[PDB]
Enzyme design. Structure first.
Site, PDB file in Angstrom:
ATOM      1  N   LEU A 445      74.696  23.562  92.500  1.00 45.20           N
ATOM      2  CA  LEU A 445      75.809  24.325  93.040  1.00 45.20           C
ATOM      3  C   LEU A 445      75.545  25.821  92.938  1.00 45.20           C
ATOM      4  CD1 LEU A 445      78.944  22.521  91.593  1.00 45.20           C
ATOM      5  CD2 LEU A 445      78.202  22.470  93.923  1.00 45.20           C
ATOM      6  N   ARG A 505      79.310  18.514  94.407  1.00 42.77           N
ATOM      7  CA  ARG A 505      78.028  18.214  93.788  1.00 42.77           C
ATOM      8  C   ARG A 505      77.775  16.720  93.675  1.00 42.77           C
ATOM      9  NH1 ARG A 505      78.364  21.043  88.205  1.00 42.77           N
ATOM     10  NH2 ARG A 505      76.147  21.119  88.771  1.00 42.77           N
ATOM     11  N   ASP A 521      73.126  23.113  87.089  1.00 40.62           N
ATOM     12  CA  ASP A 521      73.761  24.354  87.490  1.00 40.62           C
ATOM     13  C   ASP A 521      72.703  25.376  87.895  1.00 40.62           C
ATOM     14  OD1 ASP A 521      76.266  23.293  86.930  1.00 40.62           O
ATOM     15  OD2 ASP A 521      76.265  24.059  84.875  1.00 40.62           O
ATOM     16  N   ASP A 522      73.163  26.457  88.517  1.00 41.91           N
ATOM     17  CA  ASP A 522      72.260  27.494  88.994  1.00 41.91           C
ATOM     18  C   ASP A 522      71.840  28.468  87.905  1.00 41.91           C
ATOM     19  OD1 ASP A 522      74.743  28.546  88.646  1.00 41.91           O
ATOM     20  OD2 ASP A 522      74.841  29.593  90.572  1.00 41.91           O
ATOM     21  N   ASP A 523      72.431  28.382  86.713  1.00 45.28           N
ATOM     22  CA  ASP A 523      72.154  29.320  85.635  1.00 45.28           C
ATOM     23  C   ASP A 523      71.579  28.652  84.395  1.00 45.28           C
ATOM     24  OD1 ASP A 523      74.277  27.960  84.587  1.00 45.28           O
ATOM     25  OD2 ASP A 523      75.484  29.726  84.117  1.00 45.28           O
ATOM     26  N   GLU A 609      85.126  18.181  86.390  1.00 42.96           N
ATOM     27  CA  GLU A 609      84.456  17.200  87.240  1.00 42.96           C
ATOM     28  C   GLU A 609      83.529  16.299  86.433  1.00 42.96           C
ATOM     29  OE1 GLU A 609      83.301  19.801  86.424  1.00 42.96           O
ATOM     30  OE2 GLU A 609      81.216  20.210  86.973  1.00 42.96           O
ATOM     31  N   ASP A 610      82.827  16.864  85.453  1.00 45.33           N
ATOM     32  CA  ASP A 610      81.888  16.081  84.655  1.00 45.33           C
ATOM     33  C   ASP A 610      82.604  15.018  83.833  1.00 45.33           C
ATOM     34  OD1 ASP A 610      83.209  17.934  83.199  1.00 45.33           O
ATOM     35  OD2 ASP A 610      81.454  18.797  82.210  1.00 45.33           O
ATOM     36  N   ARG A 643      90.987  21.090  79.979  1.00 44.28           N
ATOM     37  CA  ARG A 643      90.222  19.875  79.753  1.00 44.28           C
ATOM     38  C   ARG A 643      90.983  18.864  78.908  1.00 44.28           C
ATOM     39  NH1 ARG A 643      84.095  19.926  80.194  1.00 44.28           N
ATOM     40  NH2 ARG A 643      83.913  21.154  82.112  1.00 44.28           N
TER      41      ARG A 643
HETATM   42  O1  UDP Z   1      84.850  28.361  91.405  1.00 40.44           O
HETATM   43  C1  UDP Z   1      83.739  27.944  91.043  1.00 40.44           C
HETATM   44  C2  UDP Z   1      83.169  28.114  89.744  1.00 40.44           C
HETATM   45  C3  UDP Z   1      81.953  27.613  89.476  1.00 40.44           C
HETATM   46  N1  UDP Z   1      81.219  26.930  90.419  1.00 40.44           N
HETATM   47  C4  UDP Z   1      79.890  26.392  90.095  1.00 40.44           C
HETATM   48  O2  UDP Z   1      80.008  25.583  88.943  1.00 40.44           O
HETATM   49  C5  UDP Z   1      78.823  25.716  88.124  1.00 40.44           C
HETATM   50  C6  UDP Z   1      79.215  26.134  86.729  1.00 40.44           C
HETATM   51  O3  UDP Z   1      79.668  27.503  86.748  1.00 40.44           O
HETATM   52  P1  UDP Z   1      79.537  28.428  85.471  1.00 40.44           P
HETATM   53  O4  UDP Z   1      78.097  28.463  84.965  1.00 40.44           O
HETATM   54  O5  UDP Z   1      80.164  29.725  85.812  1.00 40.44           O
HETATM   55  O6  UDP Z   1      80.378  27.691  84.357  1.00 40.44           O
HETATM   56  P2  UDP Z   1      79.912  27.622  82.845  1.00 40.44           P
HETATM   57  O7  UDP Z   1      78.602  26.841  82.923  1.00 40.44           O
HETATM   58  O8  UDP Z   1      79.617  29.085  82.508  1.00 40.44           O
HETATM   59  O9  UDP Z   1      80.940  26.995  81.969  1.00 40.44           O
HETATM   60  C7  UDP Z   1      77.898  26.682  88.865  1.00 40.44           C
HETATM   61  O10 UDP Z   1      76.931  25.973  89.632  1.00 40.44           O
HETATM   62  C8  UDP Z   1      78.864  27.466  89.753  1.00 40.44           C
HETATM   63  O11 UDP Z   1      78.230  27.938  90.935  1.00 40.44           O
HETATM   64  C9  UDP Z   1      81.702  26.726  91.695  1.00 40.44           C
HETATM   65  O12 UDP Z   1      81.076  26.123  92.555  1.00 40.44           O
HETATM   66  N2  UDP Z   1      82.947  27.250  91.936  1.00 40.44           N
HETATM   67 MN    MN Z   2      77.060  27.853  83.615  1.00 40.63          MN
END
Ligand code: UDP
Ligand code: MN
Ligand SMILES: *[C@@H]1O[C@H](CO)[C@@H](O[C@@H]2O[C@H](CO)[C@@H](O[C@@H]3O[C@H](CO)[C@@H](O)[C@H](O[C@H]4O[C@H](CO)[C@@H](O)[C@H](O)[C@@H]4O)[C@@H]3O)[C@H](O)[C@H]2NC(C)=O)[C@H](O)[C@H]1NC(C)=O
Ligand SMILES: *[C@@H]1O[C@H](CO)[C@@H](O[C@@H]2O[C@H](CO)[C@@H](O[C@@H]3O[C@H](CO)[C@@H](O)[C@H](O[C@H]4O[C@H](CO)[C@@H](O)[C@H](O)[C@@H]4O)[C@@H]3O)[C@H](O)[C@H]2NC(C)=O)[C@H](O)[C@H]1NC(C)=O
Ligand SMILES: *[C@@H]1O[C@H](CO)[C@@H](O[C@@H]2O[C@H](CO)[C@@H](O)[C@H](O)[C@H]2NC(C)=O)[C@H](O)[C@H]1NC(C)=O
Ligand SMILES: *[C@@H]1O[C@H](CO)[C@@H](O[C@@H]2O[C@H](CO)[C@@H](O)[C@H](O)[C@H]2NC(C)=O)[C@H](O)[C@H]1NC(C)=O
Ligand code: UDP
Ligand code: MN
Lengths: 686, 686
Positions: A445, A505, A521-523, A609-610, A643
């Site tokens: 995502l 996703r 995730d992308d990060d 979602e998870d 949650r």
């Molecule tokens: O409104 C939103 C918020 C988040 N994401 C996606 O959900 C994933 C998790 O986001 P983030 O890393 O910000 O959440 P965290 O991992 O920090 O709890 C990433 O792929 C985001 O691109 C999304 O599609 N829409």
């Molecule tokens: Mn994240």
């Protein structure tokens, strides 16, 4: 006297031509005006939307005509109805390949077809006499209750606690009868455990057949009592000629709707869909002579078995009884299974690929068509999700033994060391294991995080068994054209989404050509070695979720509710999909089969979602997930409490908590082992 | 017209009084002298040894009389037979609660009871006409073939390779018939795949019913061909009144005996024990009209599904068809299940405790009596081991969800941190998990190693959840009285053995009062922490073997055979019982249900007991074992090659290799994790 082998035409149904169905429009015939409005409307609606249905009557195997429950008093005479039947356009002389449907909603004393000659047509209704029941040819269907209404789960009480106020209850009005009545009255008087038995209805008894127990009051007045009862009593009619009645079916429906376990007195009863379902797993059938032993027998059963029966009854009701759509689909599925034809394939999520400026082996599909419908009859019909759909792959497919690959079935197998085994050198050269060679696909995502995306994508350069990467552009606006996407040796496909939602996703994107999916995730930062080991473990555990991040759920005694926890712990119950493997099968289930309420809440609360996915998989398999490494991080308050609410709501939906604890994780065999210098470890950091 | 609800007396069968059975001695009646000698001898032998049988005819539910297959030509007239029946001592006027048995061995054209009035008695035979078949009351049993002979597995060909020389074969001699014949002849002529169809018997055709396909030649002349065929064809009689014939049953028997998958043409056929078994999992039933699509349908099926059907057919044959004992037990089990009575408990290994000179919580037993016979109908009858025995515990018992313990079913549960979870401090204070509090028992062999025994026993002092220790004195001579046994806070019980054998460590000793068993040698060194973690993992994986030592099997391409390997490896397929956990259920199976040949070989070759156990468990579950730690040692050539031979022989017995590879091991969650100082690891060396 007809049976399916002598009054059905197979020449119209090649196994390879599908299962086309033609529905007569009853507004164009004399039935329509007297049909019950709700039955007619619901049936027309569901038949309009079904997938097997067609308008070309020339190619159809099956012709469906709804005579239905007619308005009371009945106006048509049997001769008139019969004349109308034989006057149908495609009622070739004997009316073969026709099924006649008569759904009961309001009247339990209506029997339209008793004096009618149906020829070679099949009959589907909730009432039968031995003189007019042809086992293996006719069908017994549930009555239509939730007409133009939603069978929402919010009113259902929880599956737990197990025991309720009353052990069993009964309410009816009308030579084993007298002994039964005396025995049950004695049980009530003995007050070993509470019960509530009534043989006279204060509310004016509903009309019934000559020797049938009549229903008391309205539908709600019965549910308000069944909700308090552990077991629901069902006494069959004394007439030996009465195979099944709409009243008993109604009682069974009501009992399953609220988790009361049916207890049936009489072995000679034909339950709905009995030729396909194992009602022993959901109800107790006891002969009338053994009535004097019922109290002890019920007291003997353990809580776990009773809870299992309640759960299975919930499944059966929700899958085959709740709606008219379910009933119609079940009828078609029964008829299709009998003539041994496979089900319709499930729909993919066709997607639009966003263009951009910068060997793959695909898994074969649809290899078990016949096997699922016939050989896996029991699992298909009695285990979730059900028989209505056909999937390209399943994680429950059987796996060949070891000697198969070396003796003729070696297509695609890559043994370690040619079958001799070995250490890391041979281990890393071949997947090995118990299943053939395979690849995986990545799904990521993105939302307003463009640059981190490019770096993370670049981190994937060099993965061995990667097939492709699928990027889910979840942002309202398109990516900028000045953005130069990297090259990693495999395709990168960007798919547009109708709107922002975490449910995207888990969509079964048409671009995914592998059973396995790596939800990331992308990060997130992951090393190559970790992913390889997770992939191997998944190859051994296709039915589970295999992921790195772990969480667990906890009890709140003061509030008698659940909690979401993320601390370091010795035991786990969840594995977040921010980095995890799973089978595409669950993507279909999540997108289409899982209740819409969960998806709507995930859209509302953009979180959670998870958790839903873990709920789903644990519900299907009843086994916990798997954690793979020691790492816990891979780099607010509202996000936290959302949650808690999500968990509690999901429990309310499913009726129980399906999550299960696991107190261990999996590592490589030779992990932290003092090997001799003639050997090398499987991995270096795993 | 009788059905079990109106021509059977339940007053003689309380659920709590067992299932006594009385057998008439046919030597005391006119039947005996004309009975076939082999049938009579085998039936008398098996009935003498069965456990339900009694001599007190006053208390019996069920009276069994063997009229059997009589010598040809039949001498008795139907009237004479009927007169003898009504003259039986306990044939109260209508002959209720009687079952009449007529086993077929040699003649497929004998029908003794066609002109006889059996009253209310049930009939068990391999031939029926609709006029004399009463579904739900009568029984269809397999013919008796292996009379006074052993159904040894050595002659059976391997389940692999999957495809054989011929796709399908047929041999018979005698309006769908002509079309069938033409279609099959065309298929043979087309030579897409090899087949062999014969509609004329060179060997003089055996006598048959008027419209039945006759068998060709002797039994061996048919097996010598079926061994080369993937599928076995079975065409049902053209007479609609003929429900089932001894000839078709014979063909089915022969096909299952050699792994040929039956293919049946005709849906109207009643297969043996069909009300209990799912023949769809072992045979293909196809309508005659669809004969033109059989070739394609067979070509479509995948190897894995076909192999699964072959395996299930092997199981069904070995369990219900092979011997007269199996047939008789199956008949009794069917009748018992119909009247809803539990099976007989399985026998323990009563042992003599050797005396010597120096809180325990027991697991409750037999809690699911009714559930197994009724609710678990499918698993009981279609999954190994079978329905003939009743076990105090099973590893397949359902487990309660998480919310059950906190809401009323908390008896015995010990949550971690009262449900809030936690780190090692809370983890070590309670077992937690998904099942209640539990203990385990140790079993240790000894042979001429007295002192090391005492030291190893002393090493057990202080184990938390230990119940007791059971020492198996496997030496010919008693221990010396100067030997002072230590004290470890729990009982030590020494059991004498009839003779030296490694099979004695898997005996279900009466002294064992726990589901779990820790099989350990007398010379092995294990730390307390390791055992605790293994116990927890087993609590999560009751159906598996959970042990520290690991091995794996390998292929030998030059010799097309298997090997036993013990090197360091990245993947495993076995876990030796020298240090391992397992359920006592498998001890019963090993001792009594598993084939005697394996036990005899283990006695002969004093090695190879652990390999057999792994074979058994993988056969039952189809899942590999679990390894728990990084340690590989816990401190000749003939001992090595003996194991190669053991593996190959065991494969020959089972017909396939059931072992499965696993590429991972399990460690604690917080293993090798950099925790903050607010947390502590679950264990210190794990
Ligand atoms: O409104 C939103 C918020 C988040 N994401 C996606 O959900 C994933 C998790 O986001 P983030 O890393 O910000 O959440 P965290 O991992 O920090 O709890 C990433 O792929 C985001 O691109 C999304 O599609 N829409
Ligand atoms: Mn994240
Ligand atoms: C690590 O572990 C600690 C210790 O367990 C944990 O802190 C705990 O957090 C929970 C959740 O916030 C606390 O329990 C809550 O307490 C508040 C009052 O302070 C209540 O309002 C909460 O109940 C609400 O929510 C329920 C549903 O979740 C509803 O059913 C209910 O009606 C209320 O609306 C709930 O009881 C708990 O008190 C603390 N414990 C301590 C010792 O602080 C922490 O969250 C874990 N994770 C992390 C990252 O630290
Ligand atoms: C560690 O790994 C090494 C390397 O794999 C392994 O050494 C191997 O041992 C096997 C077993 O002894 C050898 O294979 C045998 O070779 C002999 C001839 O040398 C054959 O006679 C054997 O076949 C017989 O046994 C079969 C059944 O097992 C029968 O089917 C057959 O008809 C014969 O009777 C068998 O082929 C193999 O050659 C060696 N490999 C090497 C490189 O030396 C070792 O055993 C493993 N364990 C340890 C502790 O080292
Ligand atoms: C199993 O069923 C599937 C779906 O019904 C079949 O796949 C279809 O096959 C037809 C004819 O070959 C194609 O026109 C469709 O495009 C296919 N659909 C999909 C989604 O691929 C498959 O051929 C069947 N396999 C058999 C009968 O062996
Ligand atoms: C389940 O069945 C077992 C075995 O048939 C029962 O255990 C026996 O119970 C009787 C009567 O209580 C005793 O005399 C026997 O000694 C028991 N046998 C053993 C091996 O313990 C058990 O009571 C049954 N449980 C029920 C019906 O709830
Ligand atoms: O003839 C024998 C040989 C061995 N054992 C037992 O089998 C186990 C394994 O023996 P050993 O340690 O000698 O075999 P190893 O572990 O060395 O391969 C021990 O409990 C022995 O007492 C036995 O009962 N009888
Ligand atoms: Mn040893």
């Amino acid at each position: 006297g007809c049976r399916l082998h002598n009054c059905f035409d197979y020449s119209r149904c090649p196994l390879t031509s599908g299962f086309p169905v033609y529905v007569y429009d009853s507004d164009q015939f004399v039935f329509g005006s007297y049909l019950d409005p709700l039955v007619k409307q619901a049936f027309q609606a569901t038949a309009r939307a079904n997938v097997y249905v067609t308008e070309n009557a020339d190619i159809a195997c099956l012709y469906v005509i709804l005579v239905g429950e007619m308005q009371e008093p009945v106006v048509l005479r049997p001769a008139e109805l019969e004349k109308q039947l034989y006057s149908l356009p495609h009622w070739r002389t004997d009316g073969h390949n026709h099924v006649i449907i008569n759904l009961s909603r309001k009247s339990d004393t209506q029997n339209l077809l008793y004096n009618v000659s149906t020829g070679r047509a099949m009959v589907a209704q909730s009432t039968f006499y031995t003189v007019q029941y042809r086992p293996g040819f006719d069908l017994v269907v549930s009555p239509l209750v939730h007409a133009m209404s939603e069978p929402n789960f919010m009113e259902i009480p929880p599956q737990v606690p197990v025991k309720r106020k009353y052990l069993f209850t009964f309410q009816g009005e009308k030579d084993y009868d007298d002994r039964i009545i005396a025995t049950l009255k004695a049980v009530q008087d003995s007050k070993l455990d509470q019960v509530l038995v009534e043989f006279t209805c204060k509310n004016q008894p509903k009309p019934s057949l000559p020797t049938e127990w009549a229903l008391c009051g309205e539908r709600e007045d019965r549910l308000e009592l069944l909700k308090l009862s552990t077991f629901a009593l069902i006494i069959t009619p004394g007439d030996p000629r009465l195979v099944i009645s709409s009243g008993c079916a109604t009682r069974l429906f009501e009992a399953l709707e609220v988790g009361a376990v049916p207890v049936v007195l009489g072995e000679q009863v034909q339950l709905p869909y009995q030729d396909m379902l194992q009602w022993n797993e959901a109800a107790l059938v006891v002969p009338k002579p053994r009535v004097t032993e019922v109290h002890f027998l019920l007291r003997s059963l353990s809580d776990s078995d009773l809870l299992a029966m309640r759960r299975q009854g919930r499944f059966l009701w929700e899958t085959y009884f709740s709606t008219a759509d379910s009933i119609f689909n079940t009828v078609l599925a029964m008829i299709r299974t009998r003539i041994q034809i496979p089900a319709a394939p499930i729909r993919e999520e066709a997607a639009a690929e966003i263009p951009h400026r910068s060997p793959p082996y695909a898994s074969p599909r649809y290899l078990r068509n016949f096997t699922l419908t016939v050989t896996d009859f029991y699992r298909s019909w009695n285990c979730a999700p059900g028989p209505f759909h056909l999937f390209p792959h399943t994680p429950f497919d059987p796996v060949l033994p070891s000697e198969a690959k070396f003796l003729g079935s070696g297509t695609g197998f890559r043994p370690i060391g040619g079958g001799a085994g070995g250490s890391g050198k041979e281990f890393q050269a071949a997947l090995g294991g118990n299943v053939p060679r395979e690849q995986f696909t990545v799904v990521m995502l993105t939302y307003e995080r463009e640059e981190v995306l490019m770096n993370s994508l670049e981190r994937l350069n060099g993965l061995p068994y990667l097939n492709k990467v699928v990027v889910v552009w979840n942002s309202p606006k398109l990516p900028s054209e000045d953005l130069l996407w990297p090259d990693i040796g495999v395709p990168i496909m960007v798919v547009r989404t109708e709107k922002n939602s975490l449910n995207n996703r888990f969509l079964p994107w048409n671009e995914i050509e592998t059973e396995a999916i790596l939800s990331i995730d992308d990060d997130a930062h992951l090393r190559h070695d970790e992913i390889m080991f997770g992939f191997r473990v998944w190859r051994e555990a296709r039915d589970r979720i295999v992921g790195f991040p772990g969480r667990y759920h906890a009890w709140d005694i003061p509030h008698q509710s659940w909690l979401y926890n993320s601390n370091y712990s010795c035991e786990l119950s969840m594995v977040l999909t921010g980095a995890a493997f799973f089978h595409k099968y669950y993507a279909y289930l999540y997108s289409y089969v899982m209740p819409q309420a969960i998806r709507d809440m995930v859209d509302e609360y953009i979180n959670c979602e998870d958790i839903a996915m873990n709920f789903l998989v644990s519900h299907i398999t009843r086994k916990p997930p798997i954690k793979v490494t020691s790492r816990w991080t891979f780099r607010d308050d509202s996000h936290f409490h959302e949650r808690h609410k999500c968990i509690n709501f999901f429990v309310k939906v499913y009726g129980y908590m399906p999550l299960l604890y696991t107190q261990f994780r999996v590592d490589s065999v030779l992990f932290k082992t003092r090997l001799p210098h003639d050997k090398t470890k499987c991995f270096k950091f795993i």
